[PDB]
Amino acid sequence: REHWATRLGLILAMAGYAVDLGNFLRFPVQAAENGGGAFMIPYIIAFLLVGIPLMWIEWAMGRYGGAQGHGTTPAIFYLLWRNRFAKILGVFGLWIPLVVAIYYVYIESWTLGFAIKFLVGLVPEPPTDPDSILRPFKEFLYSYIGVPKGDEPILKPSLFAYIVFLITMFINVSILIRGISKGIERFAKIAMPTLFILAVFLVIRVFLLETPNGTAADGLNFLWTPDFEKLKDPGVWIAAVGQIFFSLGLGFGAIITFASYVRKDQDIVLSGLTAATLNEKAEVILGGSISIPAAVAFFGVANAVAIAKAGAFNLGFITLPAIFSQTAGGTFLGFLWFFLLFFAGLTSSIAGMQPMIAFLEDELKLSRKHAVLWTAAIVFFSAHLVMFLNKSLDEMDFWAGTIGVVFFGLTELIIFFWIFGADKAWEEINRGGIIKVPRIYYYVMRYITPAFLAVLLVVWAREYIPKIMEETHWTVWITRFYIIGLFLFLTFLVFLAERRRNHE
């Protein structure tokens, strides 16, 4: 079995998976909407009671599986719980990263496309008033993606967007096809320092932003002034749990698969805690210092509430590109911003497609070359639904990348800490640990952690599912039909794997 060559490479790869566009866009928006500086209270608590324990558990499950030659959840769940229902539950944890990759790589390709367009100077050049500056960039983005102009739910991406997606897939493949150590690990050792350098440069350039509407210091102020009254709203506590859960990338299956290449007695406690900490640092220090302060510096603290409510996507793909074009060398600054977003996405997507590759290698005995190429073919083909059908991305992101991950995260907890055995799980976590998990976390993992995920799951289900099922366009059923088909497809591959094993 492949293994990580160095501890540093392992940590940077895991951190690279966790650190993405969300660090620079989703977190600042969430904090600004949920109490500002006060949001750090439930955020730290959720990090300690949910993020950290679940992360150690996913690492533990992966390393446990890898020692027996299995990197994905269909086999791993069965090893933990030898039951037919376990193999079926395990399919979910292979279905999720497969479905997520189908839309994620496309989103990632947008950042490469925009980086190129900013670099060469092919961007709108306004003109005054905020709507006169934002609109040309809204149209710029809409034309690239092919946002519907009529009543039809059809997307028409530009030729450039489509070619860049091809290039983006090729880049993912070029890394993945070289494997864990010479591919993913080697890239992580370059991309992470680069990501750090770009971020620091952006923080510095943002802090120097001075407009008649305000400064960056006003942005840091608006973002980091505590509003303790919001701590009464349960939604703020729910948002913090969700923020921690998603930013760490728990429940997606990538962590488990990456951990499956950690040697049997190699540390995961300190390594996992370090990777998690790197994500948080990149999130609150780097992410919190770029996007929001820039938006507030340019549009004033008066529009600060409106900006955060506009969302992470609008902030990163419309508002920020617009602001840069109004500054000296902002064309190059926009390039750096999207270059940053591209590497942040690329480090995550190579981690996100590895589970499918691992399944083909471990369970169907495909060579790395064949496993990578077939995984790429499936993702590339399937992405055409995301590229051409309006809201297909949103539907995939909800079922797999939102509801699915929280459900699967809870399933992981139960199967590992309740079914497999709490004592065994604990020993599987701490074995080879450079530091030991504090004894108190045994109770947290067994009772507190699954309680938080259960509350998150139920609240989001009751809040979002009825709307999703009753207020959406009929075309969402195309996406539902297809991804249900993908689940049936993986179930069939698992069937073929076990029938091959019985033969050999």
Ligand X SMILES: CN[C@H]1CC[C@@H](c2ccc(Cl)c(Cl)c2)c2ccccc21
Ligand Y SMILES: CCCCCCCCO[C@@H]1O[C@H](CO)[C@@H](O)[C@H](O)[C@H]1O
Name the residues that contact Na ion, by CB under 5 A: 16, 18-20, 23, 247, 279, 344, 347-348
Minimum distance, C-beta of residue 375 to ligand X, in the bound complex (Å): 11
In whole angstroms, what is the distance from residue 31 CA to residue 23 CA? 12
Considering the complex, what minimum distance in angstroms separates the CB of residue 101 from ligand X?
4
Nearer to ligand Y, 39 or 103 (CB): 103
By beta-carbon proximity to ligand X, the closer residue of 10 and 100 is 100
User: Which of ligand X, Na ion, ligand Y, none does 252 bind, CB closer than 5 to 8 A by kind?
Assistant: ligand X
Region from 163-171, 263-271, 381-389, 445-453 binding ligand Y, contact rule CB under 6 A: 381-389
Report the distance separating Cα 375 and Cα 371, nearest Å: 6
In whole angstroms, the minimum distance from the beta carbon of 377 to ligand Y comes to 15
Q: How far is the CB of 433 from ligand Y (least distance, A)?
A: 48
The alpha carbons of the chain give a radius of gyration, in whole angstroms, of: 22
Nearer to ligand Y, 388 or 442 (CB): 388
Beta strand extents in 333-483 (DSSP E only): none
> Closer CB to ligand Y, residue 232 or residue 473?
473
* Of positions 126, 132, 142, 154, contacts ligand Y by CB under 6 A: 154
How many angstroms separate the CA atoms of 43 and 34, rounded?
A: 10
Out of ligand X, Na ion, ligand Y, none, what residue 347 binds, judged by CB under 5 to 8 A for its kind, is Na ion
β-strand partners of 215: 210
Alpha-carbon gap, residue 102 to 389, rounded angstroms: 13
Which of Na ion, ligand Y, ligand X, none lies near 496, with the C-beta cut-off 5 to 8 A by kind?
none
Provide CB contacts within 8 A for 238, sequence distance 6+: 455, 456, 459, 460
Rounded-to-integer distance, Cα 84 and Cα 90, Å: 10
347/449 with CB nearer ligand X? 347
Report if residue 388 touches ligand Y, rule: CB under 6 A: yes
Q: How far apart (Å, rounded) are the C-alpha atoms in residues 70 and 356?
A: 12
- 3 is an interface residue for ligand Y by CB under 6 A: no
User: Which residue from 259, 296, 346, 385 is in contact with ligand Y, where contact means CB under 6 A?
Assistant: 385
Q: Alpha-carbon distance 323 to 299, whole Å?
A: 9
> Residue 389 binds which entry of ligand Y, ligand X, Na ion, none, with Cβ cut-offs from 5 to 8 Å by kind?
ligand Y
CA dihedral sign of residues 195, 197, 198, 199: positive
Among residues 102, 157, 149, 154, the alpha carbon closest in space to that of 475 is found at: 154
Of the candidates 63, 76, 416, 33, the residue with the CA atom closest to the CA atom of residue 242: 33
Q: Choose between 50 and 353: whose C-beta lies nearer to ligand X.
A: 353
Q: How far apart, in whole angstroms, are the C-alpha atoms of residue 74 and residue 494?
A: 7
Give the one entry of Na ion, ligand Y, ligand X, none that residue 34 binds, where binding means its C-beta sits below a cut-off of 5 to 8 angstroms depending on kind: none
Tell me the two tokens of residue 301: 């603290």
Residue 124 beta carbon to ligand X: minimum distance, rounded to whole angstroms: 28
* Options 269, 315, 389, 476; binder of ligand Y; rule CB under 6 A: 389
Cβ 158 to ligand Y shortest distance, Å: 11
Looking at beta carbons only, is 117 or 391 nearer to ligand Y? 391
Tokens found for residue 33: 């909407």
How far apart CA 231 and CA 234 sit, in angstroms, is 7
Question: At its nearest, how many Å lie between ligand X and the CB of residue 499?
Answer: 27
- Taking the complex as a whole, the smallest distance from the CB of residue 17 to ligand X amounts, in Å, to 6
Six-digit token string for 23? 């660090």
Q: Which is nearer to ligand Y, 149 or 424 (CB)?
A: 149
In angstroms, rounded to a whole number, what is the distance separating the alpha carbons of residues 71 and 356?
A: 10
Alpha carbons 101 and 168: distance in angstroms, whole number: 12
Return residues touching ligand X (CB under 6 A): 20, 22, 97, 100-101, 104, 246, 249, 252, 254, 348-349, 352-353, 401
Is there a binding annotation on residue 84? yes
In three-state secondary structure terms, 49 is helix
Q: Which does 385 bind (CB under 5 to 8 A by kind): ligand X, ligand Y, Na ion, none?
A: ligand Y
Residue 374 interacts with ligand Y (CB under 6 A): yes or no: no
Three-class SS of residue 29? helix
State how far the Cα of 46 lies from the Cα of 49, in Å rounded to an integer: 5
Binding site for phosphocholine, residues? 84
Binding site, residues? 84
Task: Catalog residues that contact ligand Y under the rule CB under 6 A.
Answer: 154, 384-385, 388-389
